[PDB]
mmCIF file of C-alpha atoms in Angstrom:
data_model
loop_
_atom_site.group_PDB
_atom_site.id
_atom_site.type_symbol
_atom_site.label_atom_id
_atom_site.label_comp_id
_atom_site.label_asym_id
_atom_site.label_seq_id
_atom_site.Cartn_x
_atom_site.Cartn_y
_atom_site.Cartn_z
ATOM 1 C CA UNK A 1 0.056 -0.088 -0.059
ATOM 2 C CA UNK A 2 1.151 3.918 -0.677
ATOM 3 C CA UNK A 3 2.022 5.815 2.196
ATOM 4 C CA UNK A 4 2.989 9.568 2.719
ATOM 5 C CA UNK A 5 6.415 10.430 3.580
ATOM 6 C CA UNK A 6 7.652 13.569 5.025
ATOM 7 C CA UNK A 7 11.555 14.004 5.450
ATOM 8 C CA UNK A 8 13.548 16.278 6.570
ATOM 9 C CA UNK A 9 17.124 14.645 6.283
ATOM 10 C CA UNK A 10 18.867 11.992 3.941
ATOM 11 C CA UNK A 11 18.817 9.596 6.291
ATOM 12 C CA UNK A 12 15.139 9.738 6.965
ATOM 13 C CA UNK A 13 14.149 9.471 3.411
ATOM 14 C CA UNK A 14 16.408 6.534 2.580
ATOM 15 C CA UNK A 15 14.925 4.648 6.070
ATOM 16 C CA UNK A 16 11.215 5.332 4.362
ATOM 17 C CA UNK A 17 12.293 3.369 1.240
ATOM 18 C CA UNK A 18 9.879 5.203 -1.552
ATOM 19 C CA UNK A 19 8.226 3.425 -4.093
ATOM 20 C CA UNK A 20 6.365 4.995 -7.164
ATOM 21 C CA UNK A 21 3.157 6.099 -6.463
ATOM 22 C CA UNK A 22 3.905 7.422 -2.985
ATOM 23 C CA UNK A 23 3.528 10.878 -2.028
ATOM 24 C CA UNK A 24 6.408 12.804 -0.324
ATOM 25 C CA UNK A 25 6.410 16.136 1.715
ATOM 26 C CA UNK A 26 10.369 16.812 1.421
ATOM 27 C CA UNK A 27 12.121 20.289 3.025
ATOM 28 C CA UNK A 28 15.540 20.355 3.609
ATOM 29 C CA UNK A 29 18.959 21.627 2.640
ATOM 30 C CA UNK A 30 20.623 20.823 -0.595
ATOM 31 C CA UNK A 31 21.917 22.073 -3.931
ATOM 32 C CA UNK A 32 20.686 22.691 -7.304
ATOM 33 C CA UNK A 33 21.758 20.892 -9.986
ATOM 34 C CA UNK A 34 24.098 22.774 -12.708
ATOM 35 C CA UNK A 35 23.703 22.150 -16.446
ATOM 36 C CA UNK A 36 26.408 22.581 -18.951
ATOM 37 C CA UNK A 37 25.406 24.736 -21.844
ATOM 38 C CA UNK A 38 14.347 28.986 -20.003
ATOM 39 C CA UNK A 39 15.232 28.654 -16.381
ATOM 40 C CA UNK A 40 15.676 31.836 -14.176
ATOM 41 C CA UNK A 41 18.807 30.244 -12.236
ATOM 42 C CA UNK A 42 21.140 29.539 -15.310
ATOM 43 C CA UNK A 43 23.448 27.620 -15.292
ATOM 44 C CA UNK A 44 21.588 26.374 -12.272
ATOM 45 C CA UNK A 45 18.362 24.380 -12.597
ATOM 46 C CA UNK A 46 16.229 24.393 -9.396
ATOM 47 C CA UNK A 47 13.368 21.869 -10.955
ATOM 48 C CA UNK A 48 16.224 19.582 -9.565
ATOM 49 C CA UNK A 49 17.508 19.050 -6.156
ATOM 50 C CA UNK A 50 20.803 17.444 -5.249
ATOM 51 C CA UNK A 51 20.513 15.962 -1.805
ATOM 52 C CA UNK A 52 22.801 14.628 0.290
ATOM 53 C CA UNK A 53 25.099 14.739 3.214
ATOM 54 C CA UNK A 54 28.235 15.074 1.613
ATOM 55 C CA UNK A 55 29.339 18.790 2.521
ATOM 56 C CA UNK A 56 29.179 21.385 0.083
ATOM 57 C CA UNK A 57 31.255 22.222 -2.352
ATOM 58 C CA UNK A 58 33.454 25.530 -2.122
ATOM 59 C CA UNK A 59 32.544 28.845 -4.210
ATOM 60 C CA UNK A 60 34.663 29.808 -6.909
ATOM 61 C CA UNK A 61 38.448 31.233 -6.356
ATOM 62 C CA UNK A 62 40.735 32.140 -9.337
ATOM 63 C CA UNK A 63 43.725 34.315 -9.070
ATOM 64 C CA UNK A 64 43.753 34.950 -12.517
ATOM 65 C CA UNK A 65 40.045 36.784 -11.799
ATOM 66 C CA UNK A 66 41.678 39.100 -9.082
ATOM 67 C CA UNK A 67 44.908 39.881 -11.383
ATOM 68 C CA UNK A 68 41.682 40.802 -14.139
ATOM 69 C CA UNK A 69 40.100 43.364 -11.900
ATOM 70 C CA UNK A 70 43.337 44.818 -10.528
ATOM 71 C CA UNK A 71 44.543 46.061 -13.859
ATOM 72 C CA UNK A 72 41.102 46.568 -14.942
ATOM 73 C CA UNK A 73 40.722 49.188 -11.620
ATOM 74 C CA UNK A 74 44.323 50.591 -11.979
ATOM 75 C CA UNK A 75 43.077 51.725 -15.629
ATOM 76 C CA UNK A 76 39.789 52.733 -14.623
ATOM 77 C CA UNK A 77 40.674 54.285 -11.326
ATOM 78 C CA UNK A 78 43.291 57.042 -13.602
ATOM 79 C CA UNK A 79 40.806 57.517 -16.676
ATOM 80 C CA UNK A 80 37.724 58.142 -14.725
ATOM 81 C CA UNK A 81 38.625 59.637 -10.935
ATOM 82 C CA UNK A 82 37.097 61.431 -8.706
ATOM 83 C CA UNK A 83 39.566 63.013 -5.894
ATOM 84 C CA UNK A 84 45.394 61.500 -8.233
ATOM 85 C CA UNK A 85 48.939 61.748 -6.548
ATOM 86 C CA UNK A 86 49.351 64.902 -8.432
ATOM 87 C CA UNK A 87 49.202 68.976 -7.555
ATOM 88 C CA UNK A 88 45.520 70.178 -7.846
ATOM 89 C CA UNK A 89 47.140 73.264 -10.009
ATOM 90 C CA UNK A 90 48.803 70.766 -12.441
ATOM 91 C CA UNK A 91 45.577 68.785 -12.438
ATOM 92 C CA UNK A 92 43.083 71.221 -13.519
ATOM 93 C CA UNK A 93 45.500 72.972 -16.041
ATOM 94 C CA UNK A 94 45.984 69.458 -18.043
ATOM 95 C CA UNK A 95 42.213 69.229 -18.147
ATOM 96 C CA UNK A 96 42.158 72.427 -19.841
ATOM 97 C CA UNK A 97 44.777 71.369 -22.422
ATOM 98 C CA UNK A 98 41.581 68.853 -23.445
ATOM 99 C CA UNK A 99 43.767 65.768 -22.549
ATOM 100 C CA UNK A 100 43.744 62.875 -20.055
ATOM 101 C CA UNK A 101 46.262 62.006 -17.503
ATOM 102 C CA UNK A 102 47.532 58.773 -16.133
ATOM 103 C CA UNK A 103 49.676 59.343 -13.266
ATOM 104 C CA UNK A 104 50.727 56.047 -12.398
ATOM 105 C CA UNK A 105 51.924 54.761 -15.622
ATOM 106 C CA UNK A 106 54.002 52.008 -13.640
ATOM 107 C CA UNK A 107 51.405 50.303 -11.908
ATOM 108 C CA UNK A 108 49.485 49.764 -15.435
ATOM 109 C CA UNK A 109 52.364 47.944 -17.278
ATOM 110 C CA UNK A 110 53.141 45.700 -13.982
ATOM 111 C CA UNK A 111 49.646 44.683 -13.759
ATOM 112 C CA UNK A 112 49.548 43.981 -17.783
ATOM 113 C CA UNK A 113 52.845 41.919 -16.912
ATOM 114 C CA UNK A 114 50.879 40.447 -13.902
ATOM 115 C CA UNK A 115 48.525 39.137 -15.817
ATOM 116 C CA UNK A 116 49.506 38.878 -19.445
ATOM 117 C CA UNK A 117 52.685 37.046 -17.978
ATOM 118 C CA UNK A 118 53.244 34.428 -21.203
ATOM 119 C CA UNK A 119 55.320 35.697 -23.638
ATOM 120 C CA UNK A 120 52.526 35.603 -26.095
ATOM 121 C CA UNK A 121 49.980 37.810 -24.231
ATOM 122 C CA UNK A 122 47.630 40.967 -25.157
ATOM 123 C CA UNK A 123 50.052 42.080 -27.966
ATOM 124 C CA UNK A 124 47.905 44.484 -29.021
ATOM 125 C CA UNK A 125 47.865 45.957 -25.317
ATOM 126 C CA UNK A 126 51.454 45.237 -24.638
ATOM 127 C CA UNK A 127 52.207 47.525 -27.949
ATOM 128 C CA UNK A 128 49.951 50.260 -26.354
ATOM 129 C CA UNK A 129 52.053 50.487 -23.458
ATOM 130 C CA UNK A 130 54.893 50.460 -25.438
ATOM 131 C CA UNK A 131 54.056 53.561 -27.668
ATOM 132 C CA UNK A 132 52.526 55.049 -24.396
ATOM 133 C CA UNK A 133 56.153 54.508 -22.754
ATOM 134 C CA UNK A 134 58.729 55.499 -25.463
ATOM 135 C CA UNK A 135 60.584 52.330 -25.257
ATOM 136 C CA UNK A 136 61.359 50.031 -28.433
ATOM 137 C CA UNK A 137 59.678 46.908 -27.367
ATOM 138 C CA UNK A 138 57.504 45.248 -24.219
ATOM 139 C CA UNK A 139 60.483 43.813 -22.221
ATOM 140 C CA UNK A 140 62.237 46.727 -21.645
ATOM 141 C CA UNK A 141 59.338 48.335 -20.513
ATOM 142 C CA UNK A 142 58.418 45.635 -17.831
ATOM 143 C CA UNK A 143 61.365 46.007 -16.749
ATOM 144 C CA UNK A 144 62.004 49.928 -15.900
ATOM 145 C CA UNK A 145 58.616 49.483 -14.655
ATOM 146 C CA UNK A 146 59.402 46.792 -12.449
ATOM 147 C CA UNK A 147 62.534 48.445 -11.085
ATOM 148 C CA UNK A 148 60.590 51.226 -10.188
ATOM 149 C CA UNK A 149 61.791 53.282 -12.669
ATOM 150 C CA UNK A 150 58.174 54.710 -13.720
ATOM 151 C CA UNK A 151 56.297 55.010 -10.662
ATOM 152 C CA UNK A 152 53.903 58.092 -10.292
ATOM 153 C CA UNK A 153 55.244 59.376 -14.044
ATOM 154 C CA UNK A 154 52.578 60.884 -15.945
ATOM 155 C CA UNK A 155 51.886 60.179 -19.450
ATOM 156 C CA UNK A 156 49.195 62.226 -21.315
ATOM 157 C CA UNK A 157 46.305 60.913 -23.912
ATOM 158 C CA UNK A 158 44.172 62.852 -26.229
ATOM 159 C CA UNK A 159 40.594 61.136 -24.908
ATOM 160 C CA UNK A 160 40.306 59.475 -28.227
ATOM 161 C CA UNK A 161 43.124 57.657 -27.249
ATOM 162 C CA UNK A 162 42.345 56.873 -23.859
ATOM 163 C CA UNK A 163 39.290 55.607 -24.973
ATOM 164 C CA UNK A 164 40.465 53.042 -27.022
ATOM 165 C CA UNK A 165 43.111 52.257 -24.184
ATOM 166 C CA UNK A 166 40.382 51.424 -21.611
ATOM 167 C CA UNK A 167 38.419 49.034 -24.616
ATOM 168 C CA UNK A 168 41.960 47.441 -24.911
ATOM 169 C CA UNK A 169 42.444 46.807 -21.233
ATOM 170 C CA UNK A 170 38.989 45.549 -21.699
ATOM 171 C CA UNK A 171 39.079 43.256 -24.369
ATOM 172 C CA UNK A 172 41.991 41.775 -23.430
ATOM 173 C CA UNK A 173 41.385 40.609 -20.200
ATOM 174 C CA UNK A 174 38.070 39.281 -20.932
ATOM 175 C CA UNK A 175 39.510 35.617 -22.091
ATOM 176 C CA UNK A 176 41.202 35.278 -18.878
ATOM 177 C CA UNK A 177 37.576 35.723 -16.630
ATOM 178 C CA UNK A 178 35.742 33.871 -19.330
ATOM 179 C CA UNK A 179 38.158 30.829 -19.101
ATOM 180 C CA UNK A 180 38.408 31.000 -15.417
ATOM 181 C CA UNK A 181 34.608 31.245 -15.015
ATOM 182 C CA UNK A 182 34.163 28.093 -17.165
ATOM 183 C CA UNK A 183 36.615 26.532 -15.104
ATOM 184 C CA UNK A 184 35.026 27.142 -11.956
ATOM 185 C CA UNK A 185 31.364 26.186 -13.358
ATOM 186 C CA UNK A 186 33.050 22.517 -14.159
ATOM 187 C CA UNK A 187 34.347 22.090 -10.883
ATOM 188 C CA UNK A 188 31.337 23.037 -9.093
ATOM 189 C CA UNK A 189 29.696 19.948 -10.817
ATOM 190 C CA UNK A 190 31.283 17.452 -9.180
ATOM 191 C CA UNK A 191 28.976 14.727 -7.940
ATOM 192 C CA UNK A 192 29.087 13.078 -4.679
ATOM 193 C CA UNK A 193 27.814 9.713 -4.465
ATOM 194 C CA UNK A 194 24.443 8.104 -2.801
ATOM 195 C CA UNK A 195 21.816 10.696 -1.604
ATOM 196 C CA UNK A 196 18.986 11.819 -3.728
ATOM 197 C CA UNK A 197 18.390 13.626 -6.919
ATOM 198 C CA UNK A 198 14.723 15.346 -6.585
ATOM 199 C CA UNK A 199 12.886 16.564 -9.977
ATOM 200 C CA UNK A 200 10.246 18.532 -10.563
ATOM 201 C CA UNK A 201 7.918 16.809 -13.445
ATOM 202 C CA UNK A 202 6.523 20.056 -13.906
ATOM 203 C CA UNK A 203 9.836 22.177 -13.918
ATOM 204 C CA UNK A 204 8.817 23.927 -10.894
ATOM 205 C CA UNK A 205 11.349 25.717 -9.411
ATOM 206 C CA UNK A 206 11.807 24.355 -5.906
ATOM 207 C CA UNK A 207 13.933 27.027 -4.131
ATOM 208 C CA UNK A 208 12.547 30.296 -2.674
ATOM 209 C CA UNK A 209 15.493 32.620 -3.341
ATOM 210 C CA UNK A 210 15.400 36.387 -5.510
ATOM 211 C CA UNK A 211 15.310 35.831 -8.938
ATOM 212 C CA UNK A 212 17.741 37.437 -10.930
ATOM 213 C CA UNK A 213 17.617 40.481 -12.812
ATOM 214 C CA UNK A 214 19.259 39.049 -15.965
ATOM 215 C CA UNK A 215 20.314 36.124 -16.918
ATOM 216 C CA UNK A 216 24.037 35.058 -16.519
ATOM 217 C CA UNK A 217 25.458 35.132 -19.721
ATOM 218 C CA UNK A 218 23.578 38.365 -20.366
ATOM 219 C CA UNK A 219 26.573 39.932 -18.543
ATOM 220 C CA UNK A 220 29.778 41.477 -20.061
ATOM 221 C CA UNK A 221 32.548 38.793 -19.552
ATOM 222 C CA UNK A 222 33.948 40.586 -16.034
ATOM 223 C CA UNK A 223 30.841 40.389 -14.510
ATOM 224 C CA UNK A 224 29.980 36.995 -15.330
ATOM 225 C CA UNK A 225 32.320 35.687 -12.532
ATOM 226 C CA UNK A 226 31.040 37.866 -9.690
ATOM 227 C CA UNK A 227 27.633 36.336 -10.618
ATOM 228 C CA UNK A 228 28.388 32.896 -11.109
ATOM 229 C CA UNK A 229 29.804 33.576 -7.388
ATOM 230 C CA UNK A 230 26.980 34.941 -6.342
ATOM 231 C CA UNK A 231 24.614 32.706 -7.947
ATOM 232 C CA UNK A 232 26.604 29.303 -6.190
ATOM 233 C CA UNK A 233 26.516 30.989 -2.720
ATOM 234 C CA UNK A 234 23.209 30.879 -2.697
ATOM 235 C CA UNK A 235 22.090 27.793 -4.474
ATOM 236 C CA UNK A 236 24.915 25.321 -3.472
ATOM 237 C CA UNK A 237 23.239 24.927 0.035
ATOM 238 C CA UNK A 238 19.855 26.235 0.276
ATOM 239 C CA UNK A 239 16.664 25.184 1.856
ATOM 240 C CA UNK A 240 14.070 23.610 -0.668
ATOM 241 C CA UNK A 241 10.408 22.195 -0.888
ATOM 242 C CA UNK A 242 9.534 19.634 -2.915
ATOM 243 C CA UNK A 243 5.809 17.785 -2.400
ATOM 244 C CA UNK A 244 3.975 15.689 -4.844
ATOM 245 C CA UNK A 245 3.453 11.851 -5.868
ATOM 246 C CA UNK A 246 6.289 9.704 -7.297
ATOM 247 C CA UNK A 247 6.154 9.288 -10.786
ATOM 248 C CA UNK A 248 9.526 7.247 -11.212
ATOM 249 C CA UNK A 249 12.028 6.282 -9.032
ATOM 250 C CA UNK A 250 15.826 4.762 -9.867
ATOM 251 C CA UNK A 251 18.587 3.903 -8.148
ATOM 252 C CA UNK A 252 21.772 4.601 -10.189
ATOM 253 C CA UNK A 253 25.155 2.806 -10.462
ATOM 254 C CA UNK A 254 26.569 5.587 -8.242
ATOM 255 C CA UNK A 255 24.165 4.461 -5.617
ATOM 256 C CA UNK A 256 22.104 7.845 -5.969
ATOM 257 C CA UNK A 257 18.273 7.752 -5.870
ATOM 258 C CA UNK A 258 16.556 9.443 -8.890
ATOM 259 C CA UNK A 259 12.890 10.765 -7.630
ATOM 260 C CA UNK A 260 10.724 11.843 -10.199
ATOM 261 C CA UNK A 261 7.611 14.298 -8.309
ATOM 262 C CA UNK A 262 4.733 15.517 -9.852
ATOM 263 C CA UNK A 263 2.522 17.703 -7.573
ATOM 264 C CA UNK A 264 -0.748 16.912 -6.300
#
């Protein structure tokens, strides 16, 4: 005979030995299933819950990403400031000359060397810095920079050139974040054995978390990392609720019990 099963831990649901036709009411803390490339929390799918007592996986971390962020911020700090090592009288005069000031060219070269370390990285960007720096090649520039012979030194750009350089830092760092974002996503998709995978027949979302303003990949590359990290922050160990009748049930090789639920 069919029964109603109420369970709040993985153990309780295992002890209940569910069958097809049973009615489950399930509330616990678990993880939303993550899909490799419709659904609000893309790439997570919270119509499917991975429920088991293996400790949750760690949030994404990358030092490449923070190197990329350092570079983009040093450039933004200098192209669009709002307070600038330099004397105020000098500051106003440069603005009146129709020009833009980098007051720490040395930091930008170091940050670029930091991220684009491998000899064939970001050649457009290194060439732009070389021309700004009045050297012959990138490698002299990096040493003078790393030496400390460029700290606080002042470079001036026509505004069209400064726009182009900001976009150049932008387009060159994007592939770094895109890779690391991708790498992090795959590291989030490592499934423990045992436990359950609870899926909603009608594709019902099964968590109560705020829906995201826009999908993760409508974001610009550098902010995709930030959002994926946020999405994982609230969806890898979230309270969930799932109730309905069991319409299918199967224990895979790994010992995970897949359960499909149709609500009432």
